[PDB]
């Protein structure tokens, strides 16, 4: 049910997308042990992701969970980075695969920066970096993350020690 | 598994280091909608 729809360079839509993805780049503490060295990206394309029944399967729950919190769904567009990307847009998300413990438990994670969510799409940790070369700093080999549209409603506040 | 009791979410917040952004996370697939693929390369710096 999922068709891509290429965005090109001059769409007001790819360039603030764009420029969503480059400034929440950040330095992180494993000085780019596990998704790299770098200040920021190459932008190779931008495709809007299109599933009318993924779509009303959202915007039900966003308005259940709006009708719970004083009708505010607390909608955020957020990244998302793992290897499980390409099943996801087929499926939509399912948290039935999201069962590893991370910082904050199991489930399905989202980054404000982009350069966090970069560093799970070869894995936990980088994982063993690119499949051609084997290189979690690799500067050829294409990416990909997901600019995502989340409902958060009412968001447990967890402090990190990070 | 679940959201804590009477959330939605949980909103993971940095305390140390202060130019670090927050995560999220979500237990209901269905409060997600994957609406841009982006396909990129890291670069390196000069
Ligand atoms: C093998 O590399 C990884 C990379 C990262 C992670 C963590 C975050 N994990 C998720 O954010 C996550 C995992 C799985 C899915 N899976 C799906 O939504 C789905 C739909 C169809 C098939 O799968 C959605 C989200 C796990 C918790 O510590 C932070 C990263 C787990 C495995
Ligand atoms: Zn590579």
């Known amino acids: 049910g999922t068709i891509l729809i290429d965005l090109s360079p001059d769409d007001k839509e ?3 997308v ?3 993805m480059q400034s929440t780049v950040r330095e992180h503490r494993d000085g780019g ?3 790299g060295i770098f200040n920021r990206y190459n932008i190779l394309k931008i495709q809007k992701v299109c599933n009318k029944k993924l779509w009303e399967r959202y915007t039900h ?3 259940e969970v709006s009708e719970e919190n004083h009708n505010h769904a607390n909608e955020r567009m957020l990244f998302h980075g793992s290897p499980f990307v390409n099943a996801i847009i087929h499926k939509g998300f399912d948290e039935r695969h999201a069962y590893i413990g991370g910082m904050f438990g199991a489930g399905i994670y989202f980054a404000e920066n982009s350069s ?3 560093q799970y799409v070869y894995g936990i940790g980088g994982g063993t970096g690119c499949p051609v070369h084997k290189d979690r700093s690799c500067y050829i080999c294409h990416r990909q993350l997901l600019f995502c549209r989340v409902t958060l409603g009412k968001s447990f506040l967890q402090f990190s020690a990070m | 598994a679940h959201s804590p009791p009477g959330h ?3 909103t993971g917040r940095p305390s140390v ?3 670090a952004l927050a995560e999220y996370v979500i237990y209901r ?3 997600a909608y994957p609406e841009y693929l982006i396909t990129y390369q890291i670069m390196r710096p000069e």
């Open chain 2, 29 to 31: 697939g269905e409060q």
């Open chain 1, 33 to 35: 042990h596990a998704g």
């Open chain 1, 61 to 63: 729950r966003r308005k």
């Open chain 2, 8 to 10: 939605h979410s949980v």
């Open chain 1, 18 to 20: 764009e420029e969503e």
């Open chain 1, 116 to 118: 966090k969510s970069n």
């Open chain 2, 17 to 19: 280091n202060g130019l």
């Open chain 1, 14 to 16: 790819f360039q603030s």
